[PDB]
Symmetry: C2
């Protein structure tokens, strides 16, 4: 099966960025220099990334230093904006839930839901995430963009594992 994965960092108070969409205060609050392999491990298992228009713009600008960081995967951009599709990038004007259900009926590997909250929240509400890798950073941010603001459904999950690297808590949950 094509597993749907959420791998994201957030503050103790469940903010993923500040007011501006900046992540620098989350990055500032890592304590230590030890390696973690969650990202490389997850990334090796996916063939597809799904994200909204703002996250796409942020990643292409701020994260990609020499070319688009996820050029080596299939990208869906879930947006009402009418962009130009390519062999590697597809603009999706329907709901994220409809995208994920269609993908799951297709041949392939795993799928990473990158962000933002408008993409992620409906997929959790729909119980369509298979694996949650949630990284808590040792900071109360006090304001900003909150993830899981108000899902309006109970979604029970199961704890697979938990550990700490550089004072970050890595919590790994699975769909019940």
């Amino acid at each position: 099966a094509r597993k749907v994965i959420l791998f994201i960092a957030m503050s103790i108070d469940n903010y993923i960025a500040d007011d501006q969409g900046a992540v620098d205060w989350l990055e500032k609050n890592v304590h230590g220099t030890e390696s973690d392999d969650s990202y490389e491990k997850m990334y090796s298992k996916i063939d597809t990334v799904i994200m909204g228009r703002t996250t796409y713009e942020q990643v292409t600008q701020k994260l990609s230093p020499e070319k688009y960081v996820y050029a080596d995967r299939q990208t869906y951009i879930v947006t009402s904006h009418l962009g130009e599709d390519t062999d590697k990038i597809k603009y999706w004007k329907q709901s994220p839930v409809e995208l994920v259900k269609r993908i799951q009926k297709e041949k392939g590997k795993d799928v990473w839901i990158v962000g933002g909250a408008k993409i992620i929240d409906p997929l959790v509400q729909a119980n369509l995430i298979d694996t949650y890798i949630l990284t808590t950073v040792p900071i109360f941010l006090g304001s900003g963009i909150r993830l899981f603001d108000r899902l309006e459904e109970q979604v029970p999950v199961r704890l697979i594992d938990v550990y700490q690297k550089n004072e970050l808590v890595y919590s790994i949950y699975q769909r019940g």
Copy 2:
């Protein structure tokens, strides 16, 4: 020094109770029967509990089956209600921050901040919590009473430890 401790359970989405103030869906989502000693350990170190009027009423009714569960400690009830003080219970009409600063200048042991969010949030904003024992339950609640809703200050903390019992994540942070 008199350390100020927060020991509370919440969902992945940072809810501490439902809409009604009920905690039964958090309790329902524990998976396993192994013992944990965090509560007894913390409780042994305190001489004082501080809580708001609703939490006091809930604990005296729902948690105390044969007499007030925290009768063996000094209780502060932070409320504008004019209750009747006793040798073991004191009604505090000023801010929770003023209470904690005064207590800290006095002789004694540690202090537990029980709840609710109106008591806890200002104390975190003020950086007055020394130890955080935060227990995440494997559930998105989707609505209810949220803790750390909007502290409006950055509060960096340090991860002391993290572990799992019965699929609950116990994260222990210390004041920076």
